[PDB]
Design a protein around this ligand. Structure first.
Ligand code: ADP
Ligand code: ADP
Ligand code: MG
Ligand code: MG
Lengths: 656, 515, 33
């Protein structure tokens, strides 16, 4: 192979190459324009080491504290039906909606797999909204809490247009911790310094900065606790209450054991109360530690009261629900509420005990915040240019591979040298005529008709020294062009003033009578079977100038009919009343009709389809004719088209 | 291949090579002369360590303090409409204008994307100026502050000529910090000393030194709540763009691309280049006609042309080849159109006529023949009218004025050219003419396109093909020869036409004037 | 040997190839579930 070949192949397949490259580049464009952007925020902290501090920042205690502070276990996402609706909304300049939610409690179905309950909220106006979990529709109002059907929800400052939908998921705490940890990173940048760089990536440019600020504040507060925790009585205060709290816990367990030795609503309310009691407990402990280290008018401090206000109102209505319940169920719940709350608060005190101990051994001087977290407005993902470049290069590489594949899988004839190497004379090369009528009559100036005239002048010389004036056209495979070539060649030889007879000896699928305008009665079959005379079968072509004999009715025994001596009698008779006789035949690989006819023909030519047939099929057809005692003069390549890879020049261009 | 071949190819393509390299060099020089210069300023700090210190210098607190001090969030850009106007203005020696603005507040449109509000100020004089944000035109004066339409602005010391325009942008604080951080670098220079080198790059030689001084002062003051050895100075020689390396890369790139393009053009030619290619196949080349740089016969207008000399050489070759021919009919044909068959035939007829022999030229290109145009004509009764039977043999023969030979024009274009030529009247005409003339030359259409030449060649004693020098390939000529042979016509040989001088050829013609 | 021969062999033996690969994938799915 050489460079000319590959360049020609590329030029020939240019449309396919362009299509494939364009489709991959379009997909890369679509992805790099619809993938959700990802922003990144960072902060800088000063430490007076730094190897264990890196591990302590990514511990579950710090992250859990910040999640509880910022209430990150309430996942809110705008509803778009397709996997591209969000991208379309962003490109159209539409402002994404957002809702501030401060209290959520789903009924917590908590089946085997779906551990994350979720509801859908539809915005009806600036104030009210609709809520549906599994078709249970409820109406809610911003401001006032909703506590119905074991569902608690508080919605504040709806900022969206009416008709929008939002999915609200209440995912478990560990899931939130894992989600945050996946996107959070810590570094030293110097491997020795007291400088810490914190990094956080996420899709909301403000939420991530708030989260990173909360993490920094929690770390600073935790580490500087030792400054005044040494003299703080809380340590002993923990040492005092902890044995005591266990005492009623044991009592609560034993009493429940005594009574034990399943109402759906009761456990639904029981858990909700237990959650409310928990929410109150750490909130007071949270509100405790905020009080020393912050001011009452500070926005964090003011926040806890309405949160405390919210919890108490929820509990109060919860107590209303219990009071409306039978005392038989109420008795169990009071035992259960005591057991659950006591066990829950016991763990919390153990947690708080463990937390303060770590502050004791914290060697770090205190903390210092050099740079509070800020977010880079230019997203870090997706990286558009690299995606586009990869898409284009991938398109090119797959196009080249596919085209080279098709090149190495090609077997059809491409140029007459392939036939001429075997030793087959190619007498013509007919191009495709892009123009039930004879081409040589409808459009006499077509390129294919010019090539056929070239064939005519070749034949006028080849058929000299012929045994007689009979020419048989055949082929290897069907629909190679035998009827086309034969009919048009007859037309062109007739227009030169010689009498021509065309015989459609394809008794199986011959349609020449259709293409000439016909009297289909008394074709060739009716003559051979003996029920017609030699004069009733010859008909005149209208736009031609030559006679023809049609096949007639399809016989059941085509091959055996052609062996009747009447066929040779007909040929010998016609050879004295005409200058040329052209016989069209079925293929030779399919049936044996052509080999029977060829015994009576002075000249025989094969037709090879340009791209379909292969060299071997033509060779095999030549051999099969030879074994039956018929000498094939040569071949006619038909259906040629322009291939830049050829480097073979035809005259298939207009000259006039 | 050898070195001589490639040197010849380079010499031949020298025009393209020089043009491409010149274009690349011109772009390199324009870039190296129009890119805005970038200066470097530096300072030296002593630390009484230094690993955290590079991180503390590049912190947002220090840079933010400097930015607030120097109002680096007020970006002023002198307005030049093109992406090169600033470069020309600098090259033309024009002094760049500048404005001192000490307090600025735009209404902060703050849409989804354009977080950077900006206005345009046009200088009217040394005192007053015009301001436009979105078509809102206002007039202000240096000195007195302006508080109008949510736009508040104070200008001091406009230093420019009237008519100038300036873009004033109020970009966000973080954007300014990031921009400053891009241009600011800290290095240790000893990896152990308390010495730090601070570096800052920028386009204004004085502003960057002031900025670096502010950074050093803010750092030093912050630490004492660290020693400045060398305050910031600006190197007057710009560090970018590096002109000489840009120009060298441009030149080398030009040479590389020129050479590679020449290698493609060499490897992608297929045309004939010398008669040796045809003679490898076994085709006699009887002549090689060069391009004649000079609606008239060349062999009459400029009888001393080089091409006519080559044609005379062909004439003497023919006078020997055409002996023992079955008659005195010569047919010139070719592989592809516009190869030169009409040119060769007509001029050859002229040169054979000037030697005192009677010559008949038959234009048997019944499809695109124009010989009668080139000879001066009575276009009535061409060859078509004779073949179709509506003219006799004696009304079709015409006399060339400046020639000395007769001709037969095609006549009206018939609808069935190839079928006409099969009529026996054609052979009757040739038999009659062969007894009244010394030589008959027949011009024909190409053979790959139509089949007329193969019909005519049966009655021609000699046949010759014409191949254009660079256009046709060896394959086309071989195919044409085989197609003629299939139809029973023996081609004597070939004629290479349209040659030009190629240094890479290493094959020498005699195409030079001698006289 | 050439690419055409091997491609033809795969095309002819497609029934066996598909059957074997499907059996192995089915066992993989059963184990994975
Ligand atoms: N060079 C060609 N250009 C345009 N149409 C062609 C060409 N060769 C064959 N055909 C058309 O394609 C079809 C197949 O050719 P046909 O001779 O009828 O089949 P078969 O060779 O088996 O007898 C026909 O409709 C024919 O008209
Ligand atoms: N060696 C040549 N020098 C200058 N002009 C030439 C030469 N050969 C051919 N031509 C001109 O180029 C054009 C094409 O040649 P022409 O013989 O008319 O076409 P065709 O080969 O199809 O008959 C003509 O205008 C001819 O005058
Ligand atoms: Mg057929
Ligand atoms: Mg011509």
């Amino acid at each position: 192979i050489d460079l000319g070949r590959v360049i020609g192949e590329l030029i020939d397949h240019r449309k396919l190459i362009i299509s494939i490259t364009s489709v991959f580049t379009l997909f890369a464009i679509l992805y790099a324009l619809l993938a959700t952007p990802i922003y990144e925020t960072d902060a800088l902290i000063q430490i007076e080491q730094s190897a264990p501090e890196t591990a302590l920042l990514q511990s579950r205690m710090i992250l859990g504290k910040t999640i509880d502070d910022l209430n990150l276990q309430i996942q809110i996402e705008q509803k778009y039906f397709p996997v591209i609706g969000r991208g379309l909304a962003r490109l159209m300049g539409e402002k994404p909606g957002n809702i501030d939610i401060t209290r959520l409690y789903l009924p917590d179905s908590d089946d085997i797999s779906n551990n994350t309950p979720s509801i859908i909220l539809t915005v009806k106006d600036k104030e009210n909204y609709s809520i549906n979990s599994d078709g249970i529709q409820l109406n809610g109002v911003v401001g006032t809490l909703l506590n119905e059907k074991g569902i608690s929800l508080l919605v504040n400052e709806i900022d969206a247009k009416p008709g929008d939908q939002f999915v609200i998921t209440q995912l478990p705490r560990l899931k939130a911790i894992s989600d945050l940890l996946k996107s959070f990173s810590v570094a030293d940048l110097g491997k020795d310094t007291g400088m810490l760089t914190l990094t956080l990536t996420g899709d909301n440019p403000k939420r991530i900065s708030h989260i990173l600020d909360s993490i920094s504040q929690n770390y600073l507060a935790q580490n500087i606790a030792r400054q005044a925790a040494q003299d703080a009585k809380s340590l002993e205060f923990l040492n005092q209450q902890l044995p005591k709290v266990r005492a009623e816990l044991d009592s609560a367990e034993d009493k429940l054991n005594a009574y034990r030795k399943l109402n759906m609503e009761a456990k639904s309310v029981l858990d909700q109360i237990v959650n409310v009691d928990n929410q109150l407990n750490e909130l007071t402990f949270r509100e405790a530690e905020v009080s020393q280290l912050y001011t009452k008018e500070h926005p964090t401090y003011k926040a806890l009261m309405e949160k405390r206000q919210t919890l108490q109102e929820e509990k109060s209505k919860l107590n209303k629900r219990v009071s409306s319940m039978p005392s038989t169920q109420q008795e169990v719940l009071r035992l259960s509420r005591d057991v659950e709350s006591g066990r829950a608060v016991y763990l919390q005190l153990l947690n708080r005990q463990q937390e303060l101990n770590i502050a004791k051994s914290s060697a770090i001087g205190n903390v210092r915040i050099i740079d509070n977290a800020v977010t880079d407005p230019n997203p870090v993902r997706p990286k558009k240019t690299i995606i586009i470049v990869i898409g284009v290069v991938l398109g090119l590489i797959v196009s080249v591979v596919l085209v080279l594949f098709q090149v190495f899988l090609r077997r059809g004839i491409e140029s007459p040298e392939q036939l001429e190497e075997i030793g087959i004379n190619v007498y013509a090369s007919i191009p495709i005529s892009e123009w039930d009528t004879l081409l040589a009559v409808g459009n006499p100036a077509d390129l294919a008709v010019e090539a056929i005239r070239g064939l005519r002048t070749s034949l006028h010389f080849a058929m000299m020294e012929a045994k007689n004036n009979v020419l048989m056209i055949s082929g290897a495979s069907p629909s190679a062009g035998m009827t086309f070539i034969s009919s048009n060649l007859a037309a062109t030889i007739a227009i030169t003033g010689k009498k021509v007879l065309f015989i459609d000896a394809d008794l199986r699928k011959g349609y020449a009578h259709k293409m000439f305008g016909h009297k289909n009665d008394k074709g060739l079959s009716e003559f051979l079977s003996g029920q017609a005379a030699a004069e009733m079968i010859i008909d005149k072509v209208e736009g031609g100038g030559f006679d023809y004999i049609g096949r007639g009715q399809i016989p059941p025994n085509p091959a055996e009919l052609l062996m009747h001596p009447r066929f040779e009698q007909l040929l010998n008779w016609a050879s004295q009343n005409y200058d040329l006789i052209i016989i069209d035949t079925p293929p030779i690989l399919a049936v044996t009709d052509a080999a029977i006819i060829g015994r009576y023909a002075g000249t025989c030519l094969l037709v090879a389809r340009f791209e379909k047939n292969t060299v071997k099929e033509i060779d095999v057809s030549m051999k099969r004719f030879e074994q039956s005692g018929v000498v094939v003069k040569g071949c006619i390549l038909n259906g040629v088209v322009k291939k830049a890879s050829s480097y073979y020049r035809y005259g298939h261009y207009h000259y006039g």
